[PDB]
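Page header: ASSEMBLY MODEL / two components / 816 residues total.
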Amino acid sequence: RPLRLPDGPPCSQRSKFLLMDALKLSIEDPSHEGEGIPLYDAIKCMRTFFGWKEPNVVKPHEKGINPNYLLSWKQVLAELQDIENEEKIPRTKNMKKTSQLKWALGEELRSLASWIQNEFNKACELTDSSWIELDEIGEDAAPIEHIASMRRNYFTAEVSHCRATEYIMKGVYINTALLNASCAAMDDFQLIPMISKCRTKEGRRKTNLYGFIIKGRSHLRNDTDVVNFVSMEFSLTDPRLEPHKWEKYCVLEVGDMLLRSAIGHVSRPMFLYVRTNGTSKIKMKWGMEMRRCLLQSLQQIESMIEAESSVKEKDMTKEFFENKSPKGVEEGSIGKVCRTLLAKSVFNSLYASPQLEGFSAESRKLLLIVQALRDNLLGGLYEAIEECLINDPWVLLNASWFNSFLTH
Amino acid sequence: RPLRLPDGPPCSQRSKFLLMDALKLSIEDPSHEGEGIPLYDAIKCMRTFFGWKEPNVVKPHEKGINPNYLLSWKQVLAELQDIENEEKIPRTKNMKKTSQLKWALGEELRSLASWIQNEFNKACELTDSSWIELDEIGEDAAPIEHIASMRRNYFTAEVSHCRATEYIMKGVYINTALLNASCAAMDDFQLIPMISKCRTKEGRRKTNLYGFIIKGRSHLRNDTDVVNFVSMEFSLTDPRLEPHKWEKYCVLEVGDMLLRSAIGHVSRPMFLYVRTNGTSKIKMKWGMEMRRCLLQSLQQIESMIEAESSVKEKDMTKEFFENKSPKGVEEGSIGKVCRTLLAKSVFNSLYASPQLEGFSAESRKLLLIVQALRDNLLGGLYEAIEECLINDPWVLLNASWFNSFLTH
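Prediction written out in full:
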């Protein structure tokens, strides 16, 4: 009996930042005065681009004040130009408390849509760049033993370039910046660049700018207290292709970018995805810990090597990772297994919800019952599972996956 | 005005062999007596697998004699067992001219379905293994100049592991084997293994067996003369998931395979996709030349570097491949551009048709007219294009792509 997924309008994006749709302005081997200070790096990235034009709304937010989102972007650009006019670049920039920002800062069943499976597939892919160091994974006090070290190196080599690892590092950077600003600049509408760093295939350092957030007032006395923010994220994705995805956003067209492509140089509109959002102290602390997805994925891999090693009375680390009893890998390669596990862990973090906790607990129970029936040959459990299937894209995708598992 | 795609039942697979659905039985650093002789290698690969079971039809061919396809597979397995009983393995194996083989060997609008876009996406992916040597590309008589060499090395590094390159090498091997057998064994129902070879990420030689074909009589006096064959190809793909894809096939369940996976070892049914098919001498000669897709893709890349070099009065090879004027790559990376170009070239070969030649000629004309109208601001051209849109999955996908180009 397959799970009944809800009927309704398609589900929409609810991540704290863009995933597959993100666009970076980047600088390579940066060495300007103040290299490493987020605002300085942001300005350097912004300075690489000369394609801006008069911005306009291309996908209105159905429940927001569209003119205020437009004003907010124009204010970022003007306040950055104000800095260029000053003698020195200040370490942080606090935005004028304009009417548009005061508004923006706050001072139902849905059906599964194809975009979330597509996000997940993109999260499993390899990128050109590496996102973590060779010794990134682990927190051990002492030096790791030989077999542990071997496993970490093999795993790290499969995931250091994975898109999901970019999302981890993006997530760590932005949550670190917003949590720090929430403490250090409680009354300020601080401009917070969305930054990541990577190493190119050629070995060069690269600093990336995805966009900006502006925070609101943030007197976060308890873990559950919320800081509001407005995010402004670059993209080449035309929001008119899948408008249901972008329910929570006002989308601007803000520039044009020249790109290399299969047909030679082409010019494409550059968009800016704008939304109001919020996060709590506890959520930011978890965001800061997203590197744990790597440890937890490695541990899942290590558990399987341990099982095989136990059987063959021999360490099976090399045989597992080199794919040397099994005649293949269902996902296609060991590397794809590593990345798929990682991507699931990262999406569990990015799309954390109570719907997800319930679905996860309840579905595991049903799995175990159905396997016991399958190997050897109710409602209430089903209602517990299906009550979690409301509108969350990640939970719905996972329910769709569960149903495939049942058909087979 | 978008192209009108045909209405009808979903389009079906028409490639000469399986693409994304293929499964290999493989052997590593092979060194048995007669290593390199196709039949010997096939037997070695077959010997790696102990999961066979009594075969049965799981997806019947609606217009074929299903019992004969089943008999044909059982006959392959028995004739291979006959060899194991003999003192020596013969160099080639000619099949008994049984009633099932004599039958098998011959002795309407469709709508676009999602599977062909999915095939194309899979063709663009990287694999764990390399499929070509460092000096594979090019036929030059003399040693290549420095700039040429640099470009070939950068390009080769982006495509040597590409799935599309596997399809090239698979295609070259099988067309070479069938063309050779058609000449050397004209009256025999020769068993022809479907083989490829690669090098693992660790540097080990690996020989792969995809399945078998059996040819019919082949007195190919002219280029257009046809040799019939029956193909028998391994797969983990359950044909009941997308039966419309498998219209031309009888699909058997023939074994079970133990696999590593994200959830530990799992057992999955192994299927055998069986169909009758045919090819001509001219088509096999083209199949033998599939390495030209690599040269032609490189040439497309080289043309773009030449254009940039002409502009900047400087060779732009490094700057192009290292992605150092353009601010990005529309497909995401230079590597993805290389693989996408390659995949399009490979699919043009794999899915060659008159529908494709007409669509290609006519659509290019319409592109040029629409761009001229776009930059500076009929039916008959449209009928020429749309008359090519009948049932071919590759042409239909390309028409769908053309329509996206129009919307934008």
